[PDB]
Amino acid sequence: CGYSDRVQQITLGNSTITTQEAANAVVCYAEWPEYLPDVDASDVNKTSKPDTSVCRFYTLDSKTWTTGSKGWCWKLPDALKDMGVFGQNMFFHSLGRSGYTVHVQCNATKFHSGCLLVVVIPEHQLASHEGGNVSVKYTFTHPGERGIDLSSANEVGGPVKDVLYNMNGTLLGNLLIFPHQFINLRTNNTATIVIPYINSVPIDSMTRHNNVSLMVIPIAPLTVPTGATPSLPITVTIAPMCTEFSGIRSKSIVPQ
Amino acid sequence: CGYSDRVQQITLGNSTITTQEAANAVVCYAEWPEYLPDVDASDVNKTSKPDTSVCRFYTLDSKTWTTGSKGWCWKLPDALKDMGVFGQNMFFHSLGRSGYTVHVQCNATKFHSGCLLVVVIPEHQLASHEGGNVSVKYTFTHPGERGIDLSSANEVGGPVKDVLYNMNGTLLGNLLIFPHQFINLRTNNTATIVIPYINSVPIDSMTRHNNVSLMVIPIAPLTVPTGATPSLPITVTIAPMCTEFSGIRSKSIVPQ
Amino acid sequence: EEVIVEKTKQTVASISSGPKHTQKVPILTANETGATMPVLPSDSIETRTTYMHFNGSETDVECFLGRAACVHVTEIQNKDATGIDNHREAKLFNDWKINLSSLVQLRKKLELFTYVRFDSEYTILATASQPDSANYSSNLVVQAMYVPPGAPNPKEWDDYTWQSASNPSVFFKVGDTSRFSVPYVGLASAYNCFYDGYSHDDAETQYGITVLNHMGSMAFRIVNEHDEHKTLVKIRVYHRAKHVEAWIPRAPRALPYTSIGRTNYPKNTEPVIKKRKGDIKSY
Amino acid sequence: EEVIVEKTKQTVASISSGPKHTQKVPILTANETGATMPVLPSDSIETRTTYMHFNGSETDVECFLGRAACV
Amino acid sequence: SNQTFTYINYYKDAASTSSAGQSLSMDPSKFTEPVKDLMLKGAPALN
Amino acid sequence: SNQTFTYINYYKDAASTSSAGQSLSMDPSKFTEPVKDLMLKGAPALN
Amino acid sequence: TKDEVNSYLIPLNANRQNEQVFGTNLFIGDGVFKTTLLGEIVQYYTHWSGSLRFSLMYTGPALSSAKLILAYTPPGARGPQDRREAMLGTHVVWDIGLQSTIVMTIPWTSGVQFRYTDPDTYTSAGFLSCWYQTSLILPPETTGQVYLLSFISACPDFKLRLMKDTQTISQTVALTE
RNA sequence: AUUUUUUUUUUUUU
RNA sequence: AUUUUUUUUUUUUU
């Protein structure tokens, strides 16, 4: 033996991520992602498994962690909708199912302090910022790889952006019932969460429905040492896993 | 038994072509297309086989057959470069290999006369119309699904368009050494040619190299009955077969 | 604990434990791993052998979601319909789209999970009242007709749709109850308490509300004709879940609901965490 | 379909089917014969093994005509 | 330790019956320990 | 997979009983293929 | 403007290229399917599931010829507006000859296991259309339009549950003998 | 083109 | 996450 729980390697396709100050990997509800079995299947079409071209790590854009920063939310598969062959099969097909490996980067020094809550939420239905029976419009729940900055302003047709109330009326402290992992700068620099396909249908449309949402939330505020720049980068890298596509057609057009 | 050589069905993916006045199918050099075996392989990357989404019939645009019409040429995989998931994997990958089933439609009546030569040519290198050491530019050997109308005019940087000399200096009568099939209006209305992957490399770039070219050539001129419209439509439907893609990257840009 | 089950008295609660001077520390943990270590009291103090005389049976989700709760209160009356244009607005009949998210008390118990699948048990109670002057109490019969989606909707109380050759209906007396069972009628394998999606890719379609948690609709009327007086019949529908399966435990909601199927909460709402009457070090 | 009934999971809905290049065409028919050919989706597209978890019991004419109606 | 006798179903449908009873399955580990590497108690969590 | 216990008929007449149940006979062929010569699928329908 | 025998005949024009023969949505409890024996029993039930069986019979002269392409668009995309759009879906190319019928099943392409028989946007079924693959060629000394005859039936894959009352009939007063 | 999926046992890194 | 490919024999349409 002599190995570490800290030093991990995830290889998927032609992409490889190494980490040396990891904590563990979280496997959501103790379940690895799989392909759709015949006993659960309903759609008669033979599914497409493009595995090497689509089950690979895609790196999202980086987010600046400041002291006054609130948090960021990403929707899946919406974040990976312009990313290579996966996003192309996402629009050319009417159906599709996918699991994910999410790896969130944030490295610092031993003088730094701060803690992030990386959490995956199944069916994270957002609340409108106006209340009542107001709905959230399509483009505000489908931002792409840019995600939702929760420290931004209220905008018409969009969701509420209070990080405390989790954008759905539940408090932030009870968000640990969902599959979660911390990034503590004294301990951790990465978080790995492996998501299976969680739905009440065997296979679903990947453009009108987001199965899970990924929230990176600073619980403890960022404290840089004296004279350091008051900023750290956060990077999100998501890889599809066991991805099937069914019902190929002529690329449906989504709003914007 | 009691079946026919005339009544055929080809099913590939979610696409099905029926014919009732076929002649046969031509299998090029008596060889069905296959995937790349391990003994012939050189590239170490795991290949991508998207089979259901990409190995399906794509219908090209229709061509008008007139008495003065000379013929049409199509390059593969160039003709299927904007066609769905196949054309997307063709640009997102650096390598790729594919076999094809080509089905050419031309139906008429029993009063009609005329004969087409449908021929698949491996490595159909075109001649420049100026002679000497003049080369053919990239866009004129990559027209897409529109193909090359051989009855069009000479244009600078393009190929010669004499249907007799086969655009390479060999006469049209000896073009039957290549895998060919006729469409005779008294006998035939479709032609089926199944192409394997013919190359001197195990796998090649699909954007800088066309492996085969498909020529539909009227040998006997079209004779409509008296008062009929002097025109028939010709339709080409090509399906990739046993398609692999290797070396995925960020979608190379081709000229135009 | 629930590790070891004995023969003389089963399922010990705490094992007997003594002093520790050891290099293995069960109480030092990393919650940056996203895990809860199963630390017992015997890992910190010295304990004695105690038993659980408890099974954990009332906290079963079959028991937790399986008692009758009031999901709808609607009202109809039995008055003269001659001269009335809209029978629905006059409440000669009234229909209800079946949902379990209008009483917030059942809704919070349901929305502890993402997906629930159960057979439904409905109990409908009808009570009358005559607020105006009347000589007697009418002996009234209520029809509750279960109207599936796509079925013709009633326009009047005496309309042709009430005959119900295919739609299931129940006829019961006011003051009494009608109890019937309805199976799991979701299109998918479970209902959706939450839906992060839309019906289709449209810029103006509705968020969250879906036919995945669609349970039908039932329409109410009084079969009797009109008397000299006006009598108001209040109808309360009670739902009991059974054969319950539930998935994906969620964070409990503390802010109040505002709508059906939406997760929206009111603007300028009060704080739900109780502020300390003192400082942090105060008991 | 209702042709074959399995043991591990009964009454398959669609059988697994692959590409066809054949001289027998199940989708070409004459309805001048007055008959409906039992053409399955596996005769036209490529299918996967799915099961009917369904018996066809509410469409029985005992059930169809057997509820109380106001005459 | 008596046993109840009300096991006779009167109707033909399975939706018509009474409640299913306690599962006695009781697995908290898929929420409390959803980790890839098994983590013993007493051992250091990391390295 | 329980079995219902309501198989005791209380009256003397067969018209007094409850519904008969599903036939499980299921022959569409006398409407879908009411033809004299058997017609295979895949074969040409005529000649 | 009034119901006709001609309502059952899909017109088919000669010497046309790349055009469209017909097109409809696949709400089988409404539209063209509503008065059909399939779609009159479908409206006795709330939910449907399974594969449809769509047929077309050509009734032109025996010396005529055509090639048509019958395509099914699975839900999520719009109704196809040219032949190349419908070419990317579930399609068959129909060669018209001695056998006068094509049978193109609409296979069950759905994420959810059951669709509402009443038209619903979430449980929509898709679109169906036909196009000229090559043309229609009429023999000499024959002019005019030839026709198609469209049929629908259910596969043995078909399911139908939750009986309801249909919207195809009504009355305002009771009938007398 | 008599191919497709269901899943067994062996080999390469445990 | 001890998975990936090489290929055997059986089943569904020959």
Task: Please tell me which of the candidates E36, E46, E47 has its beta carbon nearest to residue A27.
Answer: E36
The answer for A221, left when phi > 0, alpha when psi is -120 to 50, beta otherwise, is beta
From the centroid of its chain, how far is CA B74? Answer: 5
Q: Considering only CA atoms, which of B115, B159, B120 is closest in space to residue B137?
A: B159
Are C43 and C209 contacting, i.e. CB atoms less than 8 angstroms apart? Answer: no
R_g of chain C computed on alpha carbons? 27
Are A126 and A136 contacting, i.e. CB atoms less than 8 angstroms apart? Answer: yes
The answer for G34, left when phi > 0, alpha when psi is -120 to 50, beta otherwise, is alpha
DSSP assignment of chain B, as one string?
Answer: ----SS-EEEEETTEEEEESS---EEEGGG----PPPTTT----SPPB--HHHHSS-EEPPPEEE-TT---EEEEETTTTSSSHHHHHHHHHEEEEEEEEEEEEE----TT-EEEEEEEEEET-PPPBTT-TTPPPPHHHH--GGG-EETTS---TTSB---TTTTTTTS-GGGGGGSSEEEEETTT-SEEEEEE----SSSSB-SSS---EEEEEEEEEEEEPPTTS-S-EEEEEEEEEEEEEEEEE-S-PPPP-
* Chain A, chain D: beta-carbon pairs less than 8 Å apart: 27
Q: Considering only CA atoms, which of G75, G67, G54 is closest in space to residue G149?
A: G54
**Residue in this structure with the two tokens 């609340």, named with its chain if needed:** A127
Cβ neighbourhood burial of C51 (10 Å; 0-12, 13-18, 19+): middle
Q: Provide the CA C189 to C1' I2 distance, Å, integer.
A: 33
Distance CA C235, CA C126 (A): 5
Give bridge partners of residue G133 from the DSSP assignment. Answer: none
Distance CA G72, CA C37 (A): 54
Distance CA G150, CA G133 (A): 18
The answer to whether B110 CB sits below 7 Å from nucleic acid chain I is: no
Q: Take residue B186 and report the two structure tokens written for it.
A: 């008294």
Sheet with strand G115-116: strands edge to edge: G115-116, G45-49, G159-163
Q: Take residue C231 and report the two structure tokens written for it.
A: 């009598």
Q: One-letter amino acid identity for G172?
A: T
> What are the angstrom distances between the C-alpha of D69 and each of B211, C142, C264, D64?
72, 17, 44, 12
Maximum distance among all Cα pairs of chain G, rounded to whole angstroms: 59
B100 Cβ contact partners less than 8 Å away, ≥ 6 residues apart:
B33, B76, B193, B194, B195, B212, B238, B239, B240, B241
Distance CA C77, CA C79 (A): 6
Q: Take residue C95 and report the two structure tokens written for it.
A: 């229909």
Residues in chain F: 47
The answer for G139, left when phi > 0, alpha when psi is -120 to 50, beta otherwise, is beta
Q: Considering only CA atoms, which of B127, B141, B117 is closest in space to residue B215?
A: B117
Question: E32, C35: Cβ pair inside 8 Å?
Answer: yes
Q: Three-state DSSP class for A206? A: coil
Are D8 and D48 contacting, i.e. CB atoms less than 8 angstroms apart? Answer: no
A237 Cβ contact partners less than 8 Å away, ≥ 6 residues apart:
A17, A57, A58, A59, A60, A102, A103, A104, A105
Question: G92, B18: Cβ pair inside 8 Å?
Answer: yes
**Structural domains for chain G:** 1-177 (2.60.120.20)
The answer to whether D15 CB sits below 7 Å from nucleic acid chain I is: yes
**Residue in this structure with the two tokens 């050997």, named with its chain if needed:** B141
Distance CA A99, CA A97 (A): 7
Residue to substitute from B6, B19, B20, B116, interface G, most G β-carbons within 10 A = B20
From the centroid of its chain, how far is CA C255? Answer: 17
> What are the angstrom distances between the C-alpha of A104 and each of A123, A138, A182?
20, 26, 10
Q: Three-state DSSP class for G26? A: coil
Are C142 and C222 contacting, i.e. CB atoms less than 8 angstroms apart? Answer: yes
- Positions 2-41 in E, CB within 7 angstroms of strand I: 36-37
Technique behind this structure? cryo-EM
Cis previous bond, A77, omega within 30: yes
C-beta atoms surrounding G116 within 10 Å? 25
Interface present between B and G (3 or more CB pairs within 8 Å) = yes
- Positions 6-35 in A, CB within 7 angstroms of strand I: 27, 32
Q: Take residue D15 and report the two structure tokens written for it.
A: 């059988």
A174 Cβ contact partners less than 8 Å away, ≥ 6 residues apart:
C251, C252
Q: Take residue G150 and report the two structure tokens written for it.
A: 């469209």
Question: Nearest-CA residue of chain G relative to B235?
Answer: G134
Q: Provide the CA C169 to C1' I1 distance, Å, integer.
A: 54
Are D31 and G101 contacting, i.e. CB atoms less than 8 angstroms apart? Answer: yes
The answer to whether B37 CB sits below 7 Å from nucleic acid chain I is: yes
Distance CA A107, CA C101 (A): 44
Q: Three-state DSSP class for A35? A: coil
C-beta atoms surrounding C107 within 10 Å? 18
Are A245 and A38 contacting, i.e. CB atoms less than 8 angstroms apart? Answer: no
Distance CA A21, CA C51 (A): 42
Residues B88-127: b if buried by 16+ CB within 10 A, e if exposed: bbbbbbbbbbbbbbbbbbbbbbebbebbbbbbbbbebebb
Q: Provide the CA A32 to C1' H9 distance, Å, integer.
A: 25
Give bridge partners of residue E6 from the DSSP assignment. Answer: none
Distance CA B35, CA C168 (A): 58
Question: E36, A28: Cβ pair inside 8 Å?
Answer: no
R_g of chain E computed on alpha carbons? 21
G86 Cβ contact partners less than 8 Å away, ≥ 6 residues apart:
G69, G71, G73, G80, G129, G131
C-beta atoms surrounding C137 within 10 Å? 13
Q: Considering only CA atoms, which of C265, C272, C199, C238 is closest in space to residue C69?
A: C238
Give bridge partners of residue C190 from the DSSP assignment. Answer: none
Distance CA B3, CA F37 (A): 17
Q: Considering only CA atoms, which of B185, B181, B130 is closest in space to residue B160?
A: B130
C205 Cβ contact partners less than 8 Å away, ≥ 6 residues apart:
A138, C198, C199
Question: Nearest-CA residue of chain B relative to A51?
Answer: B48
Phi, psi of C50 (to 5 degrees): -125, 155
> What are the angstrom distances between the C-alpha of C100 and each of A127, B131, C239, C261, G116?
19, 81, 8, 10, 21
Give bridge partners of residue G22 from the DSSP assignment. Answer: G130
Question: G134, B227: Cβ pair inside 8 Å?
Answer: no
Q: Take residue D21 and report the two structure tokens written for it.
A: 């290049």
Are B244 and G158 contacting, i.e. CB atoms less than 8 angstroms apart? Answer: no
Q: Which chain B residues contact residue F38 at CB under 8 A?
A: none
Q: Considering only CA atoms, which of A234, A61, A14, A42 is closest in space to residue D54?
A: A42
Q: Take residue E15 and report the two structure tokens written for it.
A: 């939706």
Residues in chain B: 256
Q: Take residue A213 and report the two structure tokens written for it.
A: 């949402």
Q: Provide the CA A240 to C1' I5 distance, Å, integer.
A: 21
DSSP assignment of G62-122, as one string?
Answer: TT-EEEEEEEEE-BTB----SHHHHHTSEEEEEE-SSS-EEEEEE----SSS-EESS--ST
Q: Considering only CA atoms, which of B103, B231, B114, B102 is closest in space to residue B184?
A: B114
For the CA atoms of A234, A240, A241, A243, what is the dihedral angle to 10 degrees? 170
